[PDB]
């Protein structure tokens, strides 16, 4: 792997992550792709997704709202992040070279082209996943856990 | 690419319901939801 066009395929933009805020198999379908997390001035640093963590701070991202961060790592430096700082821009040439240098310095073997090719299909097959099982209940529960009740047309129901 | 969008009953939020899927809202969880206005040329003659 040495091209940015082939690496941007698994780039999880900010618009796609809004449809898997509460979908199961999150750690299995997300762990593997790369994101252009913003550090901050316009420089960016691509990091690897090691797992998933829940932060104690709740924040609203446009319409929805979640409290799940993203344990990332850029070669050696690792820390907690959030899904609101991720940008929708693709991996530029400078950022690609920076990520390659960081990987070569850390020693982590670069992913394989076939690995990326077989992993990018995961998001595709998960997007068109039929909600036939009993996951809607868990989704609505996790949503209402943070979404306050009074809002808005259910005030009478809540009072009753 | 039309996943058929619906509007919840009490929440008035948009939802994407495909075929062979339950009719429920993404949140709260109701069993009522209406459709959205068509995209055709709804033209009237103020007569």
């Amino acid at each position: 792997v040495s091209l940015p066009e082939e690496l941007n395929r698994v780039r999880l933009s900010r618009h796609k992550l809004e449809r898997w805020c509460h979908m199961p198999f999150f750690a299995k379908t997300v762990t593997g792709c790369f994101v252009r997390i913003g550090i901050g001035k316009p420089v960016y640093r691509v990091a690897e997704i090691t797992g998933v963590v829940e932060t104690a701070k709740v924040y609203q991202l446009g319409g929805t709202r979640t409290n799940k961060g993203l344990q990332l790592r850029h070669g050696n430096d690792q820390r907690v992040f959030r899904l609101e700082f991720v940008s929708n821009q693709e991996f530029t040439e400078s950022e690609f070279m920076k990520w390659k240098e960081a990987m070569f310095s850390a020693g982590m073997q670069l992913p394989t082209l076939d690995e990326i090719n077989k992993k990018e299909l995961s998001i595709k097959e998960a997007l068109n996943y039929k909600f036939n099982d009993q996951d809607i209940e868990e989704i609505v529960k996790e949503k209402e856990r943070f979404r306050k009740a009074p809002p808005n047309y259910a005030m009478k129901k809540t009072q009753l | 690419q039309q996943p058929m969008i619906y509007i919840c009953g009490e929440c008035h939020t948009e939802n994407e319901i495909k075929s062979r899927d339950p009719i429920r809202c993404r949140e709260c969880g109701y069993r009522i939801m209406y459709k959205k206005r068509t995209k055709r040329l709804v033209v009237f003659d103020a007569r």
């Binding site: 933009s13 900010r14 618009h15 796609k16 997390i37 913003g38 700082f85 | 996943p3």
Partner: peptide, 17 residues
């Protein structure tokens, strides 16, 4: 309807906070 970005909606940074 995959990602209607059209750029974006002002992405916040980490160090800015």
């Amino acid at each position: 309807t995959s990602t209607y970005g059209r750029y974006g909606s002002q992405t916040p940074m980490y160090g800015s906070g």
